[PDB]
Design a protein around this nucleic acid. Structure first.
Length: 39
RNA sequence: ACUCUGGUUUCUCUUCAGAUCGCAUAAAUCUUUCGCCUUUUACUAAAGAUUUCCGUGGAGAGGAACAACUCUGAGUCUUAACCCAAUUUUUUGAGGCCUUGCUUUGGCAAGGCUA
């Protein structure tokens, strides 16, 4: 966690990189489908 | 304004289930794909098909229990005060006769008499 993960490659910006226990869920704000101009 | 009809609850079982069985929502298995991946599970998430589970409705049967009683249905679903009535029914003067012509007599049609 002390590593700056904002400079990692976007393939390294995951959880448990290299482990078999991984999922498609990424973090939070790309699971969010809300826009900021609609409604 | 009347005669004949006649319940409700609850338990269990056997079947049929289209229906939002379900105005709710789980899991497993299989076949495709999907993300990891280091070995099995345990997994990621989409489709299809199966099941399983928590439930449900309809019908039938057998019990226990307010069962002894209405209600519902069917049936024409009963009558005298005040009206005897002046265009299609059962109290409405519309009633008859002959002549003429036709017709085998019978019978049919127009006319007159009309209190």
């Amino acid at each position: 966690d002390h590593f700056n993960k904002t400079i990692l490659p976007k393939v390294m910006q995951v959880k448990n990189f290299g482990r078999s226990g991984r999922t498609k869920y990424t973090h939070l704000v790309d699971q969010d489908t809300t826009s900021f101009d609609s409604a």
